[PDB]
């Protein structure tokens, strides 16, 4: 049961296509059309079929060119209300039918973010973007919006003649709208069937710049030319990835580089990943990202979670198959280094919700809960370390990739549960049974906090991390002479980013520490923004005044939120800061991602 939909389920009805033809309005903030839904009956006898909606606006429904009967329920809060739509005609099992729905959406769409051209990058033209996960599909047209029925799909988007519409499918083409001059129609084709969350659309002024075979980046013109340079790895990051994953199905894999509002650090839309600019670093340092989001093109797409009680499936797996893209290319050691800065990443997940919170267990339970509440590092992390801990127990990582693919091969165009996921283990590691009933299952599926067991980590490049992190903490102030902008002359940008994720760990740190930092380091200068993130964490948590326009200038200037929510939770837990942080929302909230918005706004307790 998929707890999160109010559709008829996959054992009712399945949708099988969706043909969408729609017209996107920015004076109005609308996306209005059809969606013409091609449905399977499940069952004998089927009289009516429940559809999810959040926000829409239904004009009609038509079946056999006739209109037909339907009613929306009583909102549910996120879940939105259901749609009920009654059949003209009985159907029997495996009969398929088409449904076309005239709808509209709500300019306070959760699945959308309309951009005035000030919010851009040109300064000329609006930009409108979707984030369809986990579940605002719902919010852009009406569907079984859950995992566990996937769908090919096909479009026509009309837009102003000056803007290009991006979607997760193959471009099929463009032409003049042959009802309007002043627009053009793009047109798209998905063939691999996909669940709705993987529906996305971008319309705005777009540039391309081919980077690989199969590979073209997407922005808008100011920011092509650093995307093309800072992506350049993606075709070789594809080679290792189909080596591991078996082939890649998709035909294309291209990037949109989004405005910086863009919430996440990407989405493995397929055909079109989504990347936050936040990655723009100028040296290829953040592209584990790619690697992470060219991964769920096998783990994620191909195999998808049934229900989002099960998104640790997609996550954790992605996380391990990311992990041994940058080990091939940057070697174990660097390998090991991630994995262990990731169970870090655990451990501060962990401290926040604290060690028996229900958000900290591997398999969730949504009942109730907003996705986008529960959304956090724990199925990444947690997931990751029970498949490295696996790895170990099983005989290293040659043997778990076999299992990894043939996983994926099992599985695939299919949605699955843990317990699917845990047959499958067995099935393949039958003659190493003994040892995998030596897991504790129930502690690392089902129980909160960190893991019962933690893997083994190479600490070769770490060591250095930890060194000089611990230098800081235990010098007094007769100490801070001795630190120099030579300690880092060895440290990488990836070892700088953990020496500050360890120093951050044991926050605060005295005041006079964290101006010497500045005054040998100067962090103020670095651009990166995991590092400038950490840092700027570092000084607000350490009550440095003079970092509070830093850490307000970021939190507003981009809004990936893994950088937005805790820098203003951060301003808002600092006396110094905290009217300025909740004055700072308030003024920007009506310009924010709404999923963003909602969030700042709960974590600030502003409503
Ligand atoms: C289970 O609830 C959720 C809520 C939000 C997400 C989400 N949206 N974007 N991302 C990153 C790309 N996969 N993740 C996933 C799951
Ligand atoms: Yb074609
Ligand atoms: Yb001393
Ligand atoms: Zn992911």
Not at 16 to 33: E, I, M, N, W
Not at 278 to 294: F, P, Q, R, Y
Not at 342 to 364: A, R
């Amino acid at each position: 049961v998929d707890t999160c939909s109010l559709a008829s389920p996959a054992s009712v009805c399945r949708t099988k296509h969706l043909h969408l033809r729609c017209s996107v309005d920015f004076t109005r903030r609308t996306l209005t059309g059809t969606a013409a839904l091609t449905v399977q009956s499940q069952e004998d006898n089927l009289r009516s079929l429940v559809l999810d909606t959040k926000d829409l606006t239904i004009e009609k429904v038509v079946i056999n060119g006739q209109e037909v009967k339907y009613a929306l329920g009583e909102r549910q809060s996120y879940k939105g209300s259901p749609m009920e739509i009654s059949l003209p005609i009985a159907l029997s099992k495996n009969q398929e039918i088409v449904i076309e729905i005239s709808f509209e959406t709500s300019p306070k769409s959760s699945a959308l973010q309309w951009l005035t051209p000030e919010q851009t990058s040109g300064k000329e033209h609006p930009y409108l973007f979707s984030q369809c996960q986990a579940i605002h599909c719902r919010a852009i047209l009406p569907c079984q919006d859950t995992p566990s029925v996937k769908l090919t799909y096909t479009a026509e988007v009309s837009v102003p003649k000056e803007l290009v519409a991006l979607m997760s499918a193959i471009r099929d083409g463009e032409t003049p709208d042959p009802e309007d001059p002043s627009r053009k129609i793009y047109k798209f084709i998905q063939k691999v069937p996909i669940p709705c969350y993987l529906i996305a659309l971008v319309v705005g002024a777009l540039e391309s710049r081919q980077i690989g075979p199969r590979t073209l980046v997407w922005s808008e013109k100011e920011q092509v030319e650093k995307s093309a340079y800072e992506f350049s790895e993606t075709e070789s990051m594809l080679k290792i990835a189909e080596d591991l994953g078996g082939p890649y199905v998709w035909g294309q894999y291209d990037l949109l580089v989004l405005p910086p509002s863009f919430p996440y650090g990407g989405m493995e839309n397929p055909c079109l990943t989504f990347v936050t600019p936040t990655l723009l670093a100028g040296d290829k340092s953040l592209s584990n990202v790619i690697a992470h989001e060219i991964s769920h093109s096998w783990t994620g797409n191909l195999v998808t979670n049934k229900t989002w009680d099960h998104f640790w499936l997609n996550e954790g797996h992605t996380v391990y198959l990311e992990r041994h893209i940058c080990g091939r290319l940057f070697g174990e050691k660097f390998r090991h280094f991630n994995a262990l800065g990731g169970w870090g990443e655990l451990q501060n997940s962990v401290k926040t919700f604290g060690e028996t919170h229900p958000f900290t267990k591997l398999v969730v339970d949504l009942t109730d809960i907003d996705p986008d509440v529960a959304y956090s590092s724990v199925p990444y992390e947690k997931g990751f370390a029970l498949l490295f801990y696996l790895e170990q127990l099983l005989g290293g990582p040659e043997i778990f990739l076999g299992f990894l693919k043939a996983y994926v091969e099992k599985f695939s165009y299919k949605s699955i549960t843990t317990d699917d996921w845990k047959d499958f283990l067995y099935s393949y590691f039958k003659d190493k049974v003994d040892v995998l009933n030596q897991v504790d299952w129930n502690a690392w599926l089902y129980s909160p906090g960190l893991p019962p067991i933690k893997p083994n980590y190479d600490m070769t490049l770490t060591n250095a991390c930890i060194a000089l992190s611990q230098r800081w903490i235990t010098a007094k102030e007769d100490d801070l002479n001795s630190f120099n902008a030579t300690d880092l002359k060895d440290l990488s940008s990836h070892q700088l980013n953990e020496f500050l994720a360890q120093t951050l760990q044991r926050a605060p740190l005295p005041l006079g520490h964290i101006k010497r930092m500045q005054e040998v380091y100067n962090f103020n200068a670095i651009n990166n923004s995991e590092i400038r993130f950490r840092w700027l964490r570092l000084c607000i948590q350490s009550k440095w005044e003079d970092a509070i326009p830093l850490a307000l200038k970021m939190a507003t200037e981009q809004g990936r939120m893994k950088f937005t929510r805790p820098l203003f939770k951060d301003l808002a837990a600092f006396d110094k800061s905290h009217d300025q942080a909740v004055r700072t929302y308030q003024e920007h909230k009506a310009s924010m991602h709404p999923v963003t918005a909602m969030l700042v706004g709960k974590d600030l307790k502003v409503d």
